[PDB]
Design a binder for this molecule. Structure first.
Ligand SMILES: Nc1ncnc2c1ncn2[C@@H]1O[C@H](COP(=O)(O)OP(=O)(O)O)[C@@H](O)[C@H]1O
Ligand SMILES: Nc1ncnc2c1ncn2[C@@H]1O[C@H](COP(=O)(O)OP(=O)(O)O)[C@@H](O)[C@H]1O
Ligand SMILES: Nc1ncnc2c1ncn2[C@@H]1O[C@H](COP(=O)(O)OP(=O)(O)O)[C@@H](O)[C@H]1O
Lengths: 499, 535, 526
C-alpha cells in the first residue's frame, strides 16, 4: 500500500521500470547470446534469440516501459537489429542519471546536456568512420566474402561455410536490388549432407495429403504457370446428388479445357482419390499456402480464377520451366522457372532434424551482414570499439565544458560502455578484466580495438574485419538519445478513468 | 538472500519499488539454472527405476484419480503432474521420441538427467554453459561415429519373423508380460504381418484399434482379423448367429425429417389429423419396404430407433443393431468396403458392406455380451483381444503390444541395428574418454563430464537388480579392449556371458542414435536458459 | 539423491508424493485392509458382514459372500482397487472362490512385505512365485478328476459340489433341499447359462424350509376394474404400443382454430382412433394382454366390456424371458394378427401369502426358466438366500460346462503346500525362500478356514501333511469333528477349473502388485 506519483518519485519510477525492462533482455545481445523459453500462457513456449522478437512477444503495463518498447519497435522497423543495443544504452543513461535526479538536477539541464553530447558524438564519429566501398567490393569480392566469414566465424562448418558465403554473395550480386527480409526465404529438407545445400531460383514446398493431386507431372513444360481457383473440385436424392455429379463433370470439363499445367483449388485435394482424379491429364493441386502465393505472383504472375468456368491468360502463361523431383525420397513441388524469380531459396540440406534454428541464426545473418556492408560505405570497428572511442571522446570533452553539463556528459560517456560489457557477458568471460584491457588499449594504444568472441581477448577488431554501417550506428545512437530525453522529460502521469 | 535487498529507501523517507517481493521470488542466472537442473533430478531419478529387464513398474495418479500402471517411460511421464516448464519440455521430448521411434523412452530421460546433473557440478566449479554445450556437441559427434563403427543391418522382408521374434522378445522381456514371451512374440508378428505396406510408408493407427476386456487367461491371447464392437442385437429374441451378413450401413434415425427453419403448421380439422396419421403410417411402411428391398442380413444404425420399427424389423426377420457410434460405422465400412448412407433415399445396393464371419462370445456369468466380425476377405483393420487377470494387466499387455509394434516398425523402415544391454554405451564411454585424452583441457573437462554422465545406463541397470557397477565396468571394458563387439555388456539374467549375441539382445541402431542426438541437443538448449522471474 | 532431505521440491497445493518403501507400506496396508474386510466369510462357519455408508444414506448390505462386500466400499489404495478388480473378474468368471482368491492375494502381499523386511528384491520374489505357481499347477493337474460322461455320476458330483458351496452360506440347515432344488433348476435350464431366465422372488414372511421351485411364474401386476379377475387358457400377447396420451411424433403441428366446434371434432377424432386401435387389438383373438406402458380408463373399460385381461408395466427383460419360456412375441403393429406369436398358458390365479396379493402363474410350455419362492423372515435374510442360490446355480452351470473336479476344503490346499515344499527343498537361493513364504500363505488360508470355527490349526496342518505324504490327495478337514476324512466320501468336492482359475488369478494379481515401486500423488481436490 505505497503510493508514489510525485514528479521526482514518478521520474525515478519510470526509469526504474525502464531498468527492469532492460534487465529482462540483458543477456540476448550478440551472436553467441543465450535465450529464454517464454510461454504465452496458451501452452506455446517461444524461443527466439533476437531481442526484438522477445520484446514483441513480451507484454508490460508500465507507461514508461510501453514508451521504451515502442521506441525499440520503431528502431527495429528502420534498419538492422539494434533494438537490444539501443534499449541497453537508454537504460544505462537512465541508471547512471539516477544519482543525479535523486538530489535535485532539473530534467531540462539533463535534456540539454544529452542533446549536446549526442551532437558531439555524432560529429566525432565522422572523423573516425572509414569507407571501404571502393576497396574492391563490387568486383574482386574477397573483402565482402571475409565480411560474410565474420558472421559465421569459428565453427567446424567452415568448409561448408565458405561455399554458403559464396552462395549468398552471388545471390546478392544477382539480386543487388537492396535485398530485404521477405525477398529471400529458406525451406527445410531432411537428410543429406550439409555440403549438399544448393540455391534454386524459386521455392520448395513438399506435397502432402491435402496439397497435390497426382504424380508424374510434365516437368519439362515450356510455359507452366500457377492457376488459382476459388471453386471446389473434389468429389431429394435426385436433386442434390445429381447436382453434385453435374458440378463435378462441368468442373472436370473446365479443367480439361483450360489446359493449365498447375491448377490450385480452394478446397483440399485428397490423395485417397488419386486414382479417381488421375484422369485430369494435367497437374492439379489445392490448399496453396499464402507464402507460396506471395512468392509466385512476383515470380512470373500466377493468376486467380473466380467463376464456375473461369479461364484466364495466365493459367498457362509464360514461365520458363517446372521442377518436381524426389527430395529425400519424397517428391517436392517447386514453382521455379520464372522470368522475374526475385526469390532465391537456400535448400536446407542437412542430417539434423533440429538444425532449423541454427540455420536461421546462421544463414539469415550472412545476407543481412553483406546487405548492410553494401548499402553503406563508411564503417567503424565493431565489438564495442566504436563505443569505447565515443566514450573516450565524451569523457575527455566533458572535463572541457564549464557548467552543469560536465557531470551529465561524463555519465553519458560512462553509459556508452555497456556494449563491450554485454558482449563479454554473453560470451561468458569475466567482464572486469576484458573491459579493463579494452578500455586501456583503446584510450592509450589504438582507436579501433574491440572485443573478440573467438579467442576471448582484446584485439583490433578493425583488422578482424568487424564492420558496421556508420549511418546505422549514428541513427541508433540518435534514437537511443531521443528515447532517454523523452523518458527524462516526464513529470506527471494522468489516468482519469472513465469508470 | 531473503526479500532481495532490505533498504526500503535510499535516504529514509517512505518508498517502495517491488510489489510484495517478500512473498515473491527473484532468480538471476546460476540460481535459475540450479532450479532447472533440480527439476531434472526430480524427473530423471523418478524415471530411472523402470530401466532394463529388472525395471519395475510405476503408480502415478493425477488430480482426477486415474489408476495407471505402465512400463514404457513415456507412458509413465505422459500424465504425471508436470509443474516446471523444462520438465514439460522433457515430457514432449519423450513424446516425440516415442512418436518417431517408439522405443528407448527410458534411455533419453535418464541420459538427459545425467548430462544435466554433471553439468551442474561443472557449473559449481564456475564454468559458463556455452563451453559445456560445445563439449557436449563434440561428445555427440564422437558417440555418433562410434555407433557408426559397429553398425549392422537386418532383413526387411515380410516373411521374416525369427530375428523379428528375437528383437520383440528382447524388448518385451523387461515388462510383466514375459510369462507368455514366445506366444506374444508370435502374436505380435502375426498382427504386424497381417496388414503391412512395403512402399516405405507408414500404417495408419486410425485403421487399427486394439482392445480387450477382463476375464480369461493370459495364454488365451490371439489375433482377431476383423472389427470388434461392444454392442448387441436390437431384439434379444432374435437368434444371435447370422451368416453371410450383408452389412447395410445406416446413419440416420428412423424418424421423419424436419428442417431447422422456424416454421409453424396449423391443424384445424379432423381431415388434417387423419391425413397426417396416414402419411406417417405410409412413410413408415415405405421405410420398411426400402429396408426389405436389398434383403440384407445386417443393418447397422447410428442413433437407434423406436419400438415400432423394432417390431417391424423383428417381424421381417431382418438382423439389425442400434446405438452404434459414427467412428464405429466408419471403421466397419472401411474394413468391409461399404459406403456412407446418411439418409433413407441413399440406401442403395452399392452402399453395403460384408463380413466373412460374425461371432458373439460370452464368458459366462457376466450379463454383458459382445459381437465381433472377423474373417473379412479384404479386411482393412486388425486387432488383438487379450484376456487376463484384471483391467491393468490387460492395459499393460496393450502397451507391451504397442511397444512390440513400434520395434517391428523400426526394424522395417530401416534395417540398421546394433546391440545394447550396456555394451554400446560403455563403448561410447571408452570412445569419449579417448577423445578426452586427446582433447585440450578446458573442453576435456566437459568431455570426461559427458563420459561420466553417459555411463549412467549401466548404473541404473545394475541398481534395478543389484550387481556391482564398477567391477562390471572393469570386466566389460577389459573384454572390449581384448576384443571389440557391439554386444559386450551386462548379463542381467545370469546367462553366464556378457555377449548379447548369444542372448539375442537386439535393438534398432536408429533408435539409440536419435536417443543420443536428442539428448545432446536438448541438454544444450536447456543449458541456454538461466532466468526465472516468478511473481 | 532423493526427497528425504532436500531444501527445495516440486509440488502443488497440498501435493506430497511419497517414496518407494512407504509406497509399498501404504499399498500393502490397503491390501491387508481389503483382505480383512473380505475374510472371515470363508468355510461353512463363515460370518456375515454389514455395510454402512459413511454418508447419511447408510447403504446396508447383509451377505455371506465377499464379492458383494467389496463391491460397495470406498477405495483409496490403488492396490485395493486392483484387488477389487481381480475379485470382480473371478466373480464374472465363476460364482465361488472369489473370497478365496481375494484372501490369497491379500496374504501374498502380506508375505511380500514380510520378505521386503527380510531384505529381498521384488524381482526375485516374482521369479520364485512364477516357479512355485508352475509347480502348484502341475501338482493340481496330477490329482484332477472328471466324471461328466456318466449322467448319474455327474448328478452325484453336482449334489456334492452344490452342497459344499452352500455349506459356507447360511442355508447349511436345509442344504440338502436347496441342493436338490438347484439341481432341478439347472437340469430344467437344459444346460443353458441364461441367468436372466432365472428369477427368485423376495417376499416377506414364512420359514426358509418352505421354499420351493414352482414350475410356473408369478405376476406382480394389478387386475383392472371392469376386467375379469380370472381368465384361463388365454393367449399371451406382449406389445410395445404406447396407447397412452397417443399423439403423432410430429411436433411441428399445432391447433389454431377459430371455433370450439373444431376442437370438439378433433377430440371425436382421437376417441374414434382409440376405438379403431382397440378393435385392432381385439381382432387378434386375445384374452390376456401384456404391456410395458400404462393403461387409461377407456381402454380398460372397453377390455372389460370385451372380457380381455390387460397387464401393464411389465419390463422388457421380464416379457422377453416370458416369451422365451412360453412362446409369445413382442409386438407394435396390430394390423398383422397372423404375424404375431402368442404363448400357451395353463394356470393363472391369485395367491394370498400373509397380507399381500400375488398373481400366480403355472403350467409352462417350454419350461426354460427357474422361479423359486422364498419365505424369508426379513429382507436381508432374503437377500442372502438369493445370493446363495445364485452362487449355487452359477457353480453348477460352470461344473456343467467343465466337469473336471478336485477335492478341496484344505486337502487340495495342503497338496499345493506339499508340492511347493518339495520344490523349495530341492532348490537353493532366495527364490526358494520366497516360494516357501508363498506356500506358508497358502497354508495360512486354511488357518482362517478352520478358525472361523475355533479349531486347531497346526495339528491339522501336520495331520494333512502326513496324509499327503502317504499320498492321500483326498484327506481334508471336517468341520463336524475337526479331523481328516475322505472328501469324496464326505462330499466336499470342488470344481477343478474354478480352483485352477483362483490359483492362477491370485498369482497373477500378486505378480502385478509386486511390480509397482513408487506411488506419486497429485494435489488432492478436497
Ligand atoms: N563475431 C563477432 N565477434 C564479436 N562481436 C560480434 C560478432 N558478431 C556480432 N557482434 C556484435 O553484435 C552486435 C550486434 O548485435 P545485435 O544485432 O544488436 O543483437 P540483437 O539482434 O539481439 O539486437 C554488434 O555490435 C557486434 O559488435
Ligand atoms: N534381456 C536384456 N538384457 C540386457 N539388456 C536389456 C534386456 N532387455 C532390455 N534391455 C535394455 O533395456 C533398455 C531399455 O529397455 P526398456 O526400458 O524395457 O524399453 P525402452 O527401450 O522403450 O526404454 C534397452 O536399452 C536395453 O539395452
Ligand atoms: N464342508 C466344507 N468343508 C471344508 N471347506 C469347505 C466346506 N464347504 C465349503 N468350503 C470352502 O469354503 C470356501 C468358501 O466358500 P464360499 O464362501 O461359498 O465362496 P468363496 O469361496 O467365494 O468364499 C470355499 O472355497 C470352499 O472350498
Amino acid at each position: 500500500g505505497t503510493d508514489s506519483s510525485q514528479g521526482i518519485p514518478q521520474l525515478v519510477s519510470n526509469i526504474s521500470a525502464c531498468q527492469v525492462i532492460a534487465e529482462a533482455v540483458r543477456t540476448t545481445l550478440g551472436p553467441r547470446g543465450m535465450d529464454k523459453l517464454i510461454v504465452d500462457g496458451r501452452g506455446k513456449a517461444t524461443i527466439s534469440n533476437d531481442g526484438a522478437t522477445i520484446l514483441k512477444l513480451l507484454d508490460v503495463v508500465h507507461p514508461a516501459a510501453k514508451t521504451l518498447v515502442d521506441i525499440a519497435k520503431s528502431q527495429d522497423a528502420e534498419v538492422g537489429d539494434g533494438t537490444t543495443s539501443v534499449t541497453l544504452l537508454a537504460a544505462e543513461f537512465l541508471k547512471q542519471v539516477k544519482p543525479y535526479v535523486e538530489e535535485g538536477l532539473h530534467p531540462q539541464i539533463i535534456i540539454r546536456a544529452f542533446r549536446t553530447a549526442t551532437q558531439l558524438a555524432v560529429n566525432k564519429i565522422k572523423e573516425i568512420a572509414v569507407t571501404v566501398k571502393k576497396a574492391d567490393k563490387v568486383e574482386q569480392r574477397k573483402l565482402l566474402e571475409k565480411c560474410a566469414m565474420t558472421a559465421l566465424s569459428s565453427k567446424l562448418i567452415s568448409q561448408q561455410k565458405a561455399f554458403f558465403a559464396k552462395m549468398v554473395v552471388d545471390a546478392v550480386m544477382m539480386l543487388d536490388d537492396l535485398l530485404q527480409l521477405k525477398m529471400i526465404g529458406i525451406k527445410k529438407v531432411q537428410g543429406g549432407a550439409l555440403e549438399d545445400s544448393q540455391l534454386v531460383a524459386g521455392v520448395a514446398f513438399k506435397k502432402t495429403f491435402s496439397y497435390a493431386g497426382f504424380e508424374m507431372q510434365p516437368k519439362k513444360y515450356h510455359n507452366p504457370k500457377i492457376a488459382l481457383l476459388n471453386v471446389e473440385l473434389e468429389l431429394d436424392y435426385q436433386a442434390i446428388v445429381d447436382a453434385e455429379w453435374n458440378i463435378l463433370y462441368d468442373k472436370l470439363e473446365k479443367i480439361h479445357h483450360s489446359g493449365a499445367k498447375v491448377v490450385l483449388s480452394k478446397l483440399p485435394i485428397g490423395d485417397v482419390a488419386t486414382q479417381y482424379f488421375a484422369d485430369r491429364d494435367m497437374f492439379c493441386a489445392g490448399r496453396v499456402p499464402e507464402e507460396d502465393l506471395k512468392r509466385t505472383m512476383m515470380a512470373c504472375g500466377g493468376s486467380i480464377q473466380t467463376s464456375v468456368n473461369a479461364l484466364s491468360a495466365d493459367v498457362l502463361g509464360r514461365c520458363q520451366v517446372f521442377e518436381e523431383t524426389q527430395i529425400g525420397g519424397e517428391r517436392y513441388n517447386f514453382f521455379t522457372g520464372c522470368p522475374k524469380a526475385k526469390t532465391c531459396t537456400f535448400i536446407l540440406r542437412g542430417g539434423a532434424e533440429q538444425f532449423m534454428e541454427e540455420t536461421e541464426r546462421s544463414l539469415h545473418d550472412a545476407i543481412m551482414i553483406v546487405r548492410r556492408a553494401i548499402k553503406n560505405d563508411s564503417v567503424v570497428a565493431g565489438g564495442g570499439a566504436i563505443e569505447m572511442e565515443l566514450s573516450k571522446y565524451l569523457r575527455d570533452y566533458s572535463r572541457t565544458i564549464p557548467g552543469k553539463q560536465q557531470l551529465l556528459i561524463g555519465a553519458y560517456a560512462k553509459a556508452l560502455e555497456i556494449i563491450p560489457r554485454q558482449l563479454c557477458d554473453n560470451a561468458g568471460f569475466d567482464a572486469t578484466n576484458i573491459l579493463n584491457k579494452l578500455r586501456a588499449r583503446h584510450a592509450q594504444g589504438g582507436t579501433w580495438y574491440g572485443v573478440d568472441i573467438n579467442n576471448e581477448d582484446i584485439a583490433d577488431n578493425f583488422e578482424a574485419f568487424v564492420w558496421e554501417p556508420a549511418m546505422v550506428r549514428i541513427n541508433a545512437l540518435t534514437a537511443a538519445s531521443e528515447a532517454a530525453c523523452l523518458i527524462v522529460s516526464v513529470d506527471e502521469t494522468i489516468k482519469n478513468p472513465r469508470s | 538472500a531473503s526479500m532481495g535487498t532490505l533498504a526500503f529507501d535510499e535516504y529514509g523517507r517512505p518508498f517502495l519499488i517491488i510489489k510484495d517481493q517478500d512473498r515473491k521470488s527473484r532468480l538471476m542466472g546460476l540460481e535459475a539454472l540450479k532450479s532447472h537442473i533440480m527439476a531434472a533430478k526430480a524427473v530423471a531419478n523418478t524415471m530411472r527405476t523402470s530401466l532394463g529387464p529388472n525395471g519395475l513398474d510405476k503408480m502415478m495418479v493425477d488430480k482426477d484419480g486415474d489408476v495407471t500402471v505402465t512400463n514404457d517411460g513415456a507412458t509413465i511421464l505422459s500424465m504425471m503432474d508436470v509443474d516446471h516448464q523444462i520438465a514439460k519440455l522433457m515430457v514432449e521430448l519423450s513424446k516425440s521420441q516415442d512418436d518417431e521411434i517408439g522405443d528407448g523412452t527410458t534411455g533419453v530421460v535418464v541420459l538427459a538427467g545425467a548430462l544435466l546433473e554433471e553439468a551442474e557440478q561443472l557449473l559449481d566449479r564456475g564454468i559458463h554453459p556455452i563451453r559445456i554445450a560445445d563439449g557436449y556437441e563434440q561428445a555427440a559427434r564422437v558417440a555418433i561415429e562410434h555407433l557408426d563403427k559397429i553398425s549392422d543391418s537386418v532383413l526387411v522382408d515380410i516373411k521374416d519373423t525369427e530375428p523379428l521374434i528375437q528383437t520383440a522378445k528382447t524388448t518385451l522381456g523387461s515388462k510383466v508380460v514375459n510369462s507368455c514371451h514366445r506366444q506374444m512374440a508370435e502374436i505380435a508378428v502375426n498382427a504386424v504381418l497381417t496388414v503391412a505396406d512395403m512402399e516405405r510408408r507408414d500404417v495408419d493407427f486410425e485403421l487399427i484399434k486394439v482392445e480387450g476386456k477382463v476375464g480369461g487367461r493370459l495364454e488365451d491371447t490371439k489375433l482377431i482379423k476383423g472389427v470388434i464392437v461392444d454392442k448387441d442385437f436390437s431384439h434379444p429374441q432374435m437368434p444371435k448367429k447370422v451368416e453371410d451378413a450383408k452389412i447395410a450401413i445406416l446413419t440416420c434415425p428412423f424418424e421423419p425429417p424436419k428442417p431447422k427453419t422456424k416454421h409453424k403448421l396449423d391443424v384445424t380439422s379432423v381431415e388434417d389429423y387423419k391425413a397426417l396419421q396416414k402419411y406417417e403410417k405410409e412413410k413408415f411402411e415405405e421405410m420398411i419396404q426400402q429396408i426389405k428391398e436389398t434383403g440384407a442380413n445386417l443393418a447397422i444404425c447410428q442413433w437407434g430407433f423406436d419400438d415400432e420399427a423394432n417390431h417391424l424389423l423383428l417381424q421381417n426377420n431382418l438382423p439389425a443393431v442400434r446405438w452404434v457410434g459414427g467412428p464405429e460405422i466408419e471403421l466397419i465400412a472401411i474394413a468391409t468396403g461399404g459406403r456412407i448412407v446418411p439418409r433413407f433415399s441413399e440406401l442403395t445396393a452399392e452402399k453395403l458392406g460384408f463380413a466373412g464371419l460374425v461371432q458373439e462370445i460370452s464368458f459366462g456369468t457376466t450379463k454383458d455380451k459382445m459381437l465381433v466380425i472377423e474373417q473379412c476377405k479384404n479386411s482393412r483393420a486388425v486387432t488383438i483381444f487379450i484376456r487376463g487377470g484384471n483391467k491393468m494387466i490387460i492395459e499393460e499387455a496393450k502397451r507391451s503390444l504397442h511397444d512390440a509394434l513400434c520395434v517391428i516398425r523400426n526394424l522395417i523402415r530401416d534395417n540398421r541395428v546394433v546391440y545394447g544391454g550396456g555394451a554400446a554405451e560403455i563403448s561410447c564411454a571408452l570412445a569419449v574418454s579417448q577423445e578426452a585424452d586427446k582433447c585440450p583441457t578446458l573442453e576435456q573437462y566437459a568431455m570426461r563430464a559427458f563420459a561420466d554422465a553417459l555411463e549412467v545406463i549401466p548404473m541404473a541397470l545394475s541398481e534395478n537388480s543389484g550387481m556391482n557397477p564398477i567391477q562390471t565396468m572393469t570386466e566389460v571394458r577389459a573384454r572390449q579392449v581384448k576384443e571389440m563387439n557391439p554386444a559386450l555388456g551386462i548379463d542381467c539374467l545370469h546367462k553366464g556371458t556378457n555377449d548379447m549375441k548369444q542372448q539375442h539382445v537386439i535393438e534398432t541402431l536408429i533408435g539409440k542414435k536419435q536417443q543420443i542426438s536428442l539428448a545432446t541437443q536438448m541438454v544444450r538448449m536447456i543449458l541456454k536458459i538461466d532466468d526465472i522471474r516468478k511473481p | 539423491a532423493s526427497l528425504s532431505l532436500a531444501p527445495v521440491n516440486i509440488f502443488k497445493a497440498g501435493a506430497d508424493e511419497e517414496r518407494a518403501e512407504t509406497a509399498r507400506l501404504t499399498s500393502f496396508i490397503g491390501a491387508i485392509a481389503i483382505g480383512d474386510l473380505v475374510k472371515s466369510t470363508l468355510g461353512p462357519k463363515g460370518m456375515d458382514k454389514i455395510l454402512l455408508s459413511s454418508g447419511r444414506d447408510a447403504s446396508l448390505m447383509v451377505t455371506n459372500d465377499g464379492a458383494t462386500i467389496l463391491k460397495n466400499i470406498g477405495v483409496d489404495n490403488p492396490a485395493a482397487k486392483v484387488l477389487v478388480d481381480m475379485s470382480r473378474v473371478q466373480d464374472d468368471e465363476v460364482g465361488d472362490g472369489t473370497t478365496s482368491v481375494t484372501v490369497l492375494a491379500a496374504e501374498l502381499l502380506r508375505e511380500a512385505e514380510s520378505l521386503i523386511a527380510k531384505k529381498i528384491h521384488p524381482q526375485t520374489i516374482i521369479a520364485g512365485w512364477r516357479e512355485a505357481t508352475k509347480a502348484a499347477r502341475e501338482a493340481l493337474l496330477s490329482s484332477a478328476v472328471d466324471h461328466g460322461s456318466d449322467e448319474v455320476k455327474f448328478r452325484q458330483d453336482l449334489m456334492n459340489i452344490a452342497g459344499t458351496t452352500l455349506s459356507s452360506k447360511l442355508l447349511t440347515h436345509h442344504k440338502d433341499h436347496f441342493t436338490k432344488l438347484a439341481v432341478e433348476a439347472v437340469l430344467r435350464l437344459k444346460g443353458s447359462g441364461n441367468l436372466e431366465a432365472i428369477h427368485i422372488i423376495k417376499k416377506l414372511g414364512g420359514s426358509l424350509a418352505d421354499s420351493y421351485l414352482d414350475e410356473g411364474f408369478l405376476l406382480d401386476k394389478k387386475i383392472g376394474v371392469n376386467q375379469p379377475k380370472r381368465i384361463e387358457n388365454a393367449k399371451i400377447l406382449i406389445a410395445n404400443t404406447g396407447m397412452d396420451t397417443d399423439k403423432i411424433k410430429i411436433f411441428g403441428s399445432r391447433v389454431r382454430v377459430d371455433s370450439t366446434a373444431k376442437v370438439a371434432e378433433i377430440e371425436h377424432a382421437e376417441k374414434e382412433k382409440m376405438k379403431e386401435k382397440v378393435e385392432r387389438i381385439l381382432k387378434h383373438g386375445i384374452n390376456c394382454f401384456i404391456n410395458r406402458q400404462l393403461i387409461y380408463n377407456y381402454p380398460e373399460q372397453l377390455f372389460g366390456a370385451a372380457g380381455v385381461m390387460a397387464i401393464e408395466h411389465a419390463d422388457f427383460a421380464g416379457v422377453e424371458r416370458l416369451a422365451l419360456v412360453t412362446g409369445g412375441e413382442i409386438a407394435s403393429t396390430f394390423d398383422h394378427p397372423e404375424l404375431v406369436k402368442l404363448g400357451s398358458c395353463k394356470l393363472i390365479e391369485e395367491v394370498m401369502i400373509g397380507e399381500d396379493k400375488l398373481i400366480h402363474f403355472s403350467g409352462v410350455a417350454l419350461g426354460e426358466a427357474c422361479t423359486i419362492v422364498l419365505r424369508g423372515a426379513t429382507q436381508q435374510i432374503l437377500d442372502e438366500a438369493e445370493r446363495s442360490l445364485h452362487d449355487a446355480l452359477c457353480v453348477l452351470a460352470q461344473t456343467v460346462k467343465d466337469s473336471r473336479t478336485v477335492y478341496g476344503g484344505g486337502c487340495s490346499e495342503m497338496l499345493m503346500a506339499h508340492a511347493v515344499t518339495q520344490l523349495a527343498n530341492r532348490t537353493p537361493g532366495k527364490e526358494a525362500v520366497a516360494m516357501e513364504s508363498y506356500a506358508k500363505a497358502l497354508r495360512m488360508l486354511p488357518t482362517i478356514i478352520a478358525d472361523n470355527a475355533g479349531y486347531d490349526s497346526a495339528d491339522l496342518v501336520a495331520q494333512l501333511r502326513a496324509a499327503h505324504s502317504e499320498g492321500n490327495t483326498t484327506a481334508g478337514l471336517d468341520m463336524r469333528e475337526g479331523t481328516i476324512g475322505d472328501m469324496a466320501i464326505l462330499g466336499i468336492t470342488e470344481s477343478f477349473q474354478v480352483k485352477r482359475q483362483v490359483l492362477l488369478s491370485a498369482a497373477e494379481a500378486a505378480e502385478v502388485i509386486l511390480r509397482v515401486d513408487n506411488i506419486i500423488k497429485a494435489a488432492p481436490r478436497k
